[model samples]
Target: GSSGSSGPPPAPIPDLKVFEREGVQLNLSFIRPPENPALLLITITATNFSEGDVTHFICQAAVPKSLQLQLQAPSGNTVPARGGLPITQLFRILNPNKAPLRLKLRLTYDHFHQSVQEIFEVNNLPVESWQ
Candidate 1:
């Protein structure tokens, strides 16, 4: 049997958009929970296409001074080689001013016995999802 709630149902999760660079791919999506217009949930999936495993994975997120950003720990610190499962991370953002959502991401990892670092900015967030 199923129980019904007094309020409306929650919104469905959106599809992930793929962003690739330097043999690394990132799938990202945003979710806005019901009744919480000021909160945003971000999901990031990282895939490694390099010649070796990716270790010491670190992701840092920054937002404008008007908004608040929090990054939860990733699923693991290591991303396996090609064809292996990717790593997933979650970010919580608070947008009290309803300002446009923009993010600057810094990614660092060890690949092929070398250290790699990349910076990326995301500005294509679907307006419907946030506002």
Candidate 2:
């Protein structure tokens, strides 16, 4: 084994991408581990950035057939004010499909007791084939 003289932890990366409107926000991030080129780590966050809490949250994702998608959160839930719940998802690229893996994300919720829905997309994600 190598020496255990490692320094302090390195700086954190700000890899989160956010979409916000009407006091509601949706955050997305894709982490591709070097050890497995065909696998993608997807993170989704539902937040109530406004002053009040949000309820009846529903998030739907439309993914292509080339990748297998899974959600790790409740189908509908409430989001805390000023802080939200973040969920992780794993996507496995089936083969050498070159087409951009499109993700259509739809979020529906009740902000301040009013029904609201937000739509976002992470489109044209290009990935080179695995080694």
Candidate 3:
């Protein structure tokens, strides 16, 4: 171990983009760890604005075959209504080729005694940070 020396600093968090539909809102952000230039971190916050709670919530992300993607379990499977706590999820992407990053997301949840599904394609990622 080095004496009295600090390791690499944490990457700065970037501005988030908002995607909303059917009373559900998703806030998305990206982070590039200083230790690994090939790794991209994605943070997602899901908020419920409907009159009922969201249940059985799940988020899935996909990338091109050149890159690899992994998702961490969400904070909880349920998002409460009326500005209650939101659900947070984390995703990690490995871009060995340093290619432009694009994400396809599939979001699903149950609300108002019905199931909701949404698909989103994210093309506006901060490429400068990823590379």
Candidate 4:
């Protein structure tokens, strides 16, 4: 359940939106229980377009200064080729919190004995701010 109760009360849920590219989906939404009014939750659904299963498939996330984030399911695993795997994570805002949070998401995996590394950038994250 998504609930926010703490400090200065919780702000209303802002209009959410997303940008998807290179098989990556980025969206901004409200997260609670962890009690964060300022957060960017990233849900990743990876589908293998190749033949065979991908082992050691890993995805990691990073952000620049004046920003903060947390990646759940941050590890390497397996994905059935031509099939898929879904990854979800919750990222919070830190100092100099602002909209359009910049993120660098790296994906690395091995398929057919071939190593693949892909880098994706997510900007212009639609986030709501409270005064």
Candidate 5:
């Protein structure tokens, strides 16, 4: 039982503070274990119902960076991408100078080179597993 000669295999911790939130009627979550096979979970919510002191002066995410040529049909064929938009607008634009306007979220996706994702703090309590 103690002679298999096996130990150590879990190392890839590149800046793993996954997420944290503060102020401005914001509720965030990043308890990632539900992101299946190749990693895909996209949830973006920006809600500022209406009040005073909210300044994000110049924040834009219309990133449809064009470099094109596409044709996919039944009788003709040409290969080009960015057409159906698998990911065209992944956004981040927050100019926080002051006053309860703190929206910070960073996202970039492309995963599966030997997967091992263990980042859990999705907000919950009470654990006692035995079934």
Candidate 6:
């Protein structure tokens, strides 16, 4: 029942690692707050990984407006719908967004007591969050 061909290629979109002790949890938010020019909607997708409850993911670059992928996260530690938490990401593409823009995920805040040491990519996803 799986198409197994939803991805374009085997290109890795970068990643962030989190280790939970006593079964702790990790939360992520990609925010594009309200601004004057363009507004980018937050997209948090959860895939069923073999090790974790869910894996949050997004495109490495802004997708085309024609592709309206459903942003849902089933492995929510709390919310369970949109990757357990909600977030925003800002991207006012004033020019041609064709280059392979890298993803930018915010730092891990919940781990004040703990420590996080990696980078998560958030490629101005939601390709056409403007129109």
Backbone clashes for every candidate come to 0, 0, 0, 1, 0, 9
All candidates: TM-score: 0.80, 0.67, 0.81, 0.58, 0.20, 0.26
Report the C-alpha lDDT of model 5 over 72-104, residue by residue, as the tens digit: 122111111212111112222221221212223
Tens digit of per-residue lDDT, candidate 6, span 1-131: 76666556632223223322333333323344446323333344322222333223322333444322233333333223323443333233332343333334433322323443444554443433333
Question: Judged by TM-score relative to the true structure, which candidate is superior, 2 or 6?
Answer: 2
Clash-forming residue pairs, model 4 = 100-125
Model 3 agreement with the true structure over 3-118: per-residue lDDT tens digits: 77579875566766657767878888777777987888888888888898888888888888998888786788878888899887788888888678688888877879987777
The whole-model C-alpha lDDT of candidate 5 against the native structure comes to 0.24
Which pairs of residues collide in model 5? none
Candidate 1 C-alpha RMSD relative to the actual structure: 3.0
Every model's Cα RMSD, please?
3.0, 4.7, 3.5, 6.2, 19.6, 12.2
Q: Give the best candidate by lDDT.
A: 3
Better of 4 and 6 by TM-score: 4
lDDT of 3 at 120: 77
Which residue pairs overlap in candidate 3's backbone? none
Off by over 4 Å in 3: 1-13
Candidate 2 per-residue lDDT, tens place, 16-131, comes to 45476676556666665668656666667666668987766666677778766766645446667766564334444443464455677776667665777667776534343222
Between candidates 2 and 3, the one scoring higher on TM-score is: 3
- The lDDT for every candidate, in the order shown, is 0.78, 0.61, 0.79, 0.55, 0.24, 0.35
Better of 1 and 5 by TM-score: 1
Best by TM-score: 3
Ranking by lDDT: 3, 1, 2, 4, 6, 5
What TM-score, to 2 decimals, does candidate 3 have? 0.81
